[PDB]
Write a protein that binds this ligand. Structure first.
Ligand SMILES: Cc1cn([C@H]2C[C@H](O)[C@@H](CO)O2)c(=O)[nH]c1=O
Ligand SMILES: Cc1cn([C@H]2C[C@H](O)[C@@H](CO)O2)c(=O)[nH]c1=O
Lengths: 204, 196
């Protein structure tokens, strides 16, 4: 059971992951989680994160270069993911391939029918052979609320993606299209106040 | 000993690799060779090559993105390079880290003492852990000659010229270590003796 949690920055995905982990365990299922990008576990991921903070010259200016780095981070995680799928009943991922499709498309002002989303699919699933997720869960949230989380959980720093209010808005919209068309597999759209117990009963 | 053969497209690096290898062997030393990018061997390399042929959207438009891909390709070869260095007296690399510094600086119209060349050193040697070469041998060729003897880089003549110019300065400034500049007519025996 591979489950990917998706959503814009500040959507509160960690929380959902935690609450979902609990509900699955209470139901007698073993759970392991993994978050992408794998900061500290991938140079590709670390360089990508630093680039979003203005480092590494013109790296972040290229939409496909950034998508590639995130895709290569996941590629070096293929074994880790498979290992978790064998060691646990449910594997929960905080962000996965659809993050790349949603953000790359939004950065290019494209929708789900654009080249970037199709490119992401070919590269990650068909070429890098990343495991297709059984369920992709979109945590839909208020754009204002999500944006405030970023401004708050920081000024208490936001990278180039987090500061781009319009990018976040378009990402949420592409996410909705992906979910609607079952991009990459079966999706489930949930809200913040979603019930963990039923969510887990629904997914499994 | 780790030796890197550097030069622009059409320098004749493969030929020099064979000659130098032949000379070291005759001198009673075991030699192993490796070439970069490791086309067909790593995703980073293939994506980079493809991007140079117009694939992958705006990937190639980013100098640091292309550089990062070639660096990540070498990063995947670290275990291979270390193995070769443990089993052979001399390891000769056809293109190495300096290639990234030269092409990146050239695309940005920077020089050997620039930011990109410094970035390449910070990233590849320290962060990625690529062994620094004992010698970097530049098979220098003028733009005129190179022009005499097909991706986005290959087709860009001004880029090739500027890359040659940066290589010449990297060598003169001892970027990342000791350099030797040689021509296609260099005597293998003397070269091998100089490097020994
Ligand atoms: C994992 C991942 C994150 N991102 C974005 C979301 C954030 O702004 C940031 C780190 O999670 O990068 C992608 O664009 N693609 C990806 O594949
Ligand atoms: C190995 C390497 C090659 N290149 C260039 C040279 C050619 O145009 C092509 C393949 O060798 O890419 C780099 O820009 N950086 C590198 O690190």
């Amino acid at each position: 059971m591979l489950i990917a949690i998706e959503g814009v920055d500040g959507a509160g995905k960690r929380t959902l992951v935690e609450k979902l982990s609990g509900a699955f365990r209470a139901a007698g299922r073993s759970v392991a989680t993994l978050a992408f990008p794998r900061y500290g576990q991938s140079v590709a991921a670390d360089i990508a994160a630093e680039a979003l903070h203005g480092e590494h010259g013109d790296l972040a200016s290229s939409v496909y270069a950034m998508a590639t780095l995130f895709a290569l981070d996941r590629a070096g995680a293929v074994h880790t993911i498979q290992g978790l799928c064998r060691g646990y009943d449910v594997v929960i991922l905080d962000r996965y391939v659809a993050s790349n499709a949603a953000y790359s498309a939004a950065r290019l002002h494209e929708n789900a029918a654009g080249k970037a989303a199709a490119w992401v699919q070919r590269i990650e699933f068909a070429r890098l052979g990343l495991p297709k997720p059984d369920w992709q869960v979109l945590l839909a949230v208020s754009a204002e609320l999500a944006g405030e989380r970023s401004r708050g959980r920081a000024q208490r720093a936001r990278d180039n993606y987090e500061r781009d209010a319009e990018l976040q808005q378009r990402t949420g919209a592409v996410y909705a299209e992906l979910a609607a068309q079952g991009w990459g597999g079966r999706w489930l759209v949930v809200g913040a106040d979603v019930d963990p117990g039923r969510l887990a009963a629904t997914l499994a």
